[PDB]
């Protein structure tokens, strides 16, 4: 053979064209090796099945603020990548920020946010403007429904879509995001009540997707690509995502200018984001080619190549030398206080799950019921505390 393979898993299923063309970049500079770019369905399952094997692939698209990756780096599945050379490339302090035992085990590359697009030309059109409080945002849907447009498109069928509404509605109605898991996460069993006044602002938060005539047509059973499509077509004016969607968009070539905006808090200059790593990549411990992974790992951290992936993905990456868009692009008004305080990372971070949460939160926009919502939360906590 004289040849290497090496895997790597992917979970950037928005950015496969890209990264697959890297590869081949990769590919061609170094002809001893080869790449196997994996994108399989369900692929967190199936990466938790084949960890607990021991048959981890060489390199890992893995979220360094998941469970999976603090309970695998502390079990020593993952190598020690804190005196690499090549991470010296990462800049914010990015990859000690999801450090485990004071080691870092993966290259956060770029960080994700959430915040809500919308059509610039229609907003502009219709004499909308970007809200500021809950209350603006409230009459901002209903203003839409008046002048006979669609709002938002909801992907009812991925309930994941709204992970980062649902955070964010808890982080903008307690003051943050430790703020948010002191509510949820370390509270005490059975204590989040309808009747708190937390759960009221968060039901509110939840609620401006519930306004009459908010959300399209066969929205119940709309998926993720479906969506996509409706906004981009310029059937809905708003779909709540994260930074990850707009590659996706462009790519369904839009007719109209795209912006995003911070969902806001109860009031002005307190709107908030939330993400994590995006592109993050983890190495196997037990890789039979250490040197090819390593090999891979370090090419993507060249500028050159970071920005090839920039250019497409367009989510804030934390590598050196690469020039960022400016206040023109669409992802400026979700991703304008990346890498700050604004910026917190994902919930899940100090939960065991996030599934269930995906779930109750699309299934109170499905039913509208709140009571069922709080008791969704309590039993989807009460494991975790116990
Ligand atoms: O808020 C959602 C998500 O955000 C972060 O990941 C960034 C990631 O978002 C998108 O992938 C979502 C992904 O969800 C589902 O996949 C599983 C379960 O099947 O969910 C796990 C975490 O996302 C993952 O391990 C599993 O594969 C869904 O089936 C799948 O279709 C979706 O693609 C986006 O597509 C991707 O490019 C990234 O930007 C955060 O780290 C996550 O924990 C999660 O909160």
Same mark, same amino acid.
């Given at each position: 053979d004289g040849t290497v393979t090496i895997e790597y898993f992917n979970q950037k299923k928005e950015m496969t064209k890209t990264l697959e063309e890297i590869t081949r970049d990769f590919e061609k500079e170094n002809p001893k090796i080869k790449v196997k770019v994996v994108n399989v369905p369900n692929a967190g399952e199936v990466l938790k099945t084949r960890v607990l094997a021991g048959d981890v692939p060489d390199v890992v698209n893995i979220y360094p603020q998941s469970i999976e990756l603090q309970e695998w780096a502390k079990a020593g599945?993952? $190598? !020690?990548?804190?005196? /690499? !050379?090549?991470?010296?490339?990462?800049?914010? #302090?990015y990859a000690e920020k999801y450090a485990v035992n004071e080691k870092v085990y993966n290259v956060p590359f770029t960080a994700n946010a959430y915040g809500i697009y919308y059509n610039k030309d229609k907003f502009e059109e219709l004499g909308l403007k970007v809200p500021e409080t809950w209350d603006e945002f409230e009459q901002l849907v209903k203003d839409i429904v008046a002048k006979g447009q669609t709002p938002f498109g909801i992907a009812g069928a991925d309930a994941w879509t709204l992970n980062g509404y649902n955070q964010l509605a808890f982080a903008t109605a307690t003051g943050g995001g430790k703020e948010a898991n002191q509510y949820?996460?370390? *509270?005490?069993?059975? +204590?989040?009540?309808?009747? !708190?006044p937390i759960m009221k602002d968060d039901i509110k938060v939840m609620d401006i997707l519930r306004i009459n005539g908010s959300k399209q047509k066969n929205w119940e059973g709309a998926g993720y690509t479906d969506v996509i499509g409706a906004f981009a077509r310029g059937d809905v004016l708003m779909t709540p995502n994260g930074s990850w969607a707009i590659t996706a968009i462009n790519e369904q070539k839009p007719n109209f200018k795209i912006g995003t905006f911070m969902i806001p #808090? /109860? $009031?002005? #200059? %307190?709107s908030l984001t939330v993400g994590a790593g995006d592109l993050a990549w983890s190495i196997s411990a037990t890789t039979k080619h250490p040197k090819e992974a390593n090999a891979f790992v370090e090419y993507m951290t060249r500028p050159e190549v970071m920005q090839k992936y920039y250019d497409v993905d367009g989510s804030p990456t934390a590598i050196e030398g690469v020039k960022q868009a400016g206040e023109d692009s669409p992802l400026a008004g979700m991703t304008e206080? +990346?890498?700050? !305080?604004?910026?917190?990372? @994902?919930? %899940? %971070?100090? @939960?065991? *799950? $996030?599934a269930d949460f995906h779930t109750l939160t699309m299934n109170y926009v499905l039913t509208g019921d709140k009571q069922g919502m709080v008791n969704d939360l309590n039993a989807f906590f009460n494991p975790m505390k116990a």
């Open positions: 599945v993952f $190598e !020690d990548l804190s005196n /690499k !050379d090549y991470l010296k490339r990462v800049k914010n #302090g949820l996460r370390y *509270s005490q069993p059975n +204590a989040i009540k309808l009747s !708190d #808090g /109860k $009031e002005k #200059g %307190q206080y +990346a890498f700050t !305080d604004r910026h917190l990372v @994902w919930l %899940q %971070q100090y @939960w065991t *799950s $996030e």
